[PDB]
């Protein structure tokens with residue numbers, strides 16, 4: 156007997172994996188929560204030791220989704236925290252439609268759908284941005300951003316079925332999942348771990364501007380708390396909401412912290428030196444990674460899975476992307492984190508869980 | 515019969531005038547509060563209609579301070595929210611010493627001294643800065659900053675007399691006092707009011723960087739709340755604490771808002787155009803101001819009193835001065851304001867109080 160029943164679509168992801176932890180805490184709003192977690196891969200080892208009912212399901216395949224999710228009649232809240240690995244508006248849209256079409260007719264006590272998008276809503280796509288600080292009310296850019304498609308489906312389907320909705324636009328996520336397609340902290344920890352292995356310094360590859368500019372981020376657990384808040388507090392219902400840690404930082408200070416955490420020398424940004432691609436620097440390091448994995452008895456991960464060096468490249472030529480938390484705060488959500496501390500905490504947790512070497 | 519008795523040194527100032535309002539609210543921590551307000555000028559009209567016992571006193575004159583403050587035996591908390599009008603370490607230090615030397619021996623139930631300094635602690639003096647975001651633990655710069663003198667006296671005097679202390683470092687203050695030596699909002703409202711009068715556009719005089727960079731500020735009432743918090747909550751005692759609104763903004767967006775609030779056309783920053791001095795643009799506008807005052811039946815103010823065009827000049831060549839609120843938040847203070855809204859609210863309040871024209 157449970158109070159609430161969550162479907163977490165993307166349970167292996169950087170946010171879904173936090174939700175799987177946060178939803179099972181005793182103090183969590185709306186608890187006690189039962190948790191169904193969906194992902195495409197077979198349940199990895201680390202997740203089998205969690206109290207989540209894992210449903211292995213390719214949610215881009217409609218018949219499969221119907222057969223796997225239509226029996227789930229007790230669901231009360233959906234948390235869509237997934238995307239396919241690309242910016243295809245059509246294929247991302249299919250996943251979300253298949254979730255709703257499979258669950259809405261079958262779960263008579265469904266109440267709410269949380270959709271997670273992101274701050275790209277304000278400045279465009281990875282394939283003429285608004286100025287910042289970004290606020291929720293800013294109109295859509297004239298670009299094929301799959302976030303637009305997902306919102307439209309969200310509004311259409313919740314409205315005709317008398318369900319409430321929320322849209323969450325997190326900033327860059329600080330999290331611990333080694334299964335994510337965009338995990339900045341594990342990406343940078345892997346780079347550091349490789350530098351250390353090869354007796355090299357932690358050399359910063361990015362732009363001058365990304366070194367020196369203000370940046371913001373969100374801890375995965377805070378995103379989970381923010382999503383859980385919008386799912387249970389009537390004041391938050393049917394709102395588009397940004398989600399960040401509530402402060403700002405600079406990569407320059409994070410880089411120092413990173414070097415210290417791995418006990419290696421740092422080479423910061425060098426005046427006049429231009430961005431180099433971390434993707435290229437790490438192009439054929441997969442066997443090095445495989446060695447470090449076996450050597451340290453880590454959870455086995457492939458280099459391309461734990462790390463997204465392409466994504467660090469983007470973070471390191473980005474600037475002026477700060478988002479505002481005023482709306483959420485004026486609605487009464489006062490969750491926050493110290494971003495420097497959240498970063499270190501992600502490092503610790505990935506060591507703790509044995510995704511990366513201790514010490 | 516009162517619970518707490520506040521001495522507000524600088525009661526006509528941009529923060530002291532907020533404290534005079536905030537301390538008299540029924541829900542205010544530590545209330546009901548009795549309020550003594552000190553300033554050098556005779557009580558201006560607007561302040562005579564407030565329930566504060568006004569003590570006219572030149573606090574740089576020791577005998578005068580002794581005779582005026584030594585009878586005040588019931589004081590429990592001092593809020594030092596004043597400075598002389600300059601950066602002289604010696605003359606600022608005299609004021610603060612004279613307050614403590616006159617009150618500490620005479621008020622046996624004295625508990626706490628709040629000292630207000632500022633973010634200049636981190637980057638130097640108006641007459642080689644730390645990088646930001648500024649955190650409280652950053653060491654002193656090797657400069658003659660009178661803030662250093664005030665802290666040293668604060669620590670010395672509170673320690674030997676078994677009193678608790680706090681140091682508050684607000685960001686740029688958004689407030690309503692027409693008696694302040696550094697009131698950015700009234701300064702900009704005056705400029706706007708003059709543009710409107712002379713049928714000119716609201717032309718931005720500042721630098722490119724100050725137009726485009728992230729900036730932060732603090733609402734006066736929030737500073738008062740922050741100071742009151744540190745004065746009554748044991749968790750906050752004997753701490754140095756930054757104070758800002760909890761978000762960031764850009765002058766570019768504020769400028770638009772300012773133009774709208776005065777119904778005049780805006781001319782924003784123009785690429786390649788260099789900073790001009792607002793002090794010089796307004797050099798002999800005092801009779802214009804005098805006219806606008808009589809014409810609109812405003813509280814009578816001299817141009818040099820309501821406005822500090824020199825100070826807007828500094829704000830408009832400044833950048834990279836963001837301060838962190840993480841410490842305060844981790845101690846449990848979750849007060850905040852929307853800076854865009856706080857700015858507008860200062861405008862409204864100055865109209866409300868008749869310091870500047872309505873509409």
Ligand SMILES: NC(=O)C1=CN([C@@H]2O[C@H](COP(=O)(O)OP(=O)(O)OC[C@H]3O[C@@H](n4cnc5c(N)ncnc54)[C@H](OP(=O)(O)O)[C@@H]3O)[C@@H](O)[C@H]2O)C=CC1
Pocket residue numbers: 164165166167168169170171193194195196197212213214215236237238239240250271272273274324325326327328329332334335336337338339
């Ligand atoms: N820093 C970040 O990571 C940020 C992300 N966002 C946004 O948040 C949203 C969710 O992304 P994020 O949390 O990063 O996701 P992750 O890449 O960490 O996780 C993706 C999840 O979706 C699952 N998934 C992918 N394709 C399928 C499929 N066909 N069927 C079933 N499950 C699938 C994955 O499991 P499996 O591996 O088995 O396929 C995985 O569990 C995206 O819109 C993203 O842009 C926004 C801001 C920041």
Ligand SMILES: NC(=O)C1=CN([C@@H]2O[C@H](COP(=O)(O)OP(=O)(O)OC[C@H]3O[C@@H](n4cnc5c(N)ncnc54)[C@H](OP(=O)(O)O)[C@@H]3O)[C@@H](O)[C@H]2O)C=CC1
Pocket residue numbers: 523524525526527528529530552553554555556571572573574595596597598599609630631632633683684685686687688691693694695696697698
């Ligand atoms: N934006 C801002 O204004 C910021 C200010 N700060 C800092 O806060 C501190 C306090 O300043 P702020 O609140 O701006 O002050 P204001 O200039 O608004 O107020 C000064 C107050 O002190 C009184 N005062 C000045 N000299 C004397 C004297 N000899 N005897 C008695 N009273 C006196 C003034 O009254 P009277 O007019 O009668 O002399 C007035 O009430 C300063 O260190 C300042 O740097 C920090 C960050 C931002």
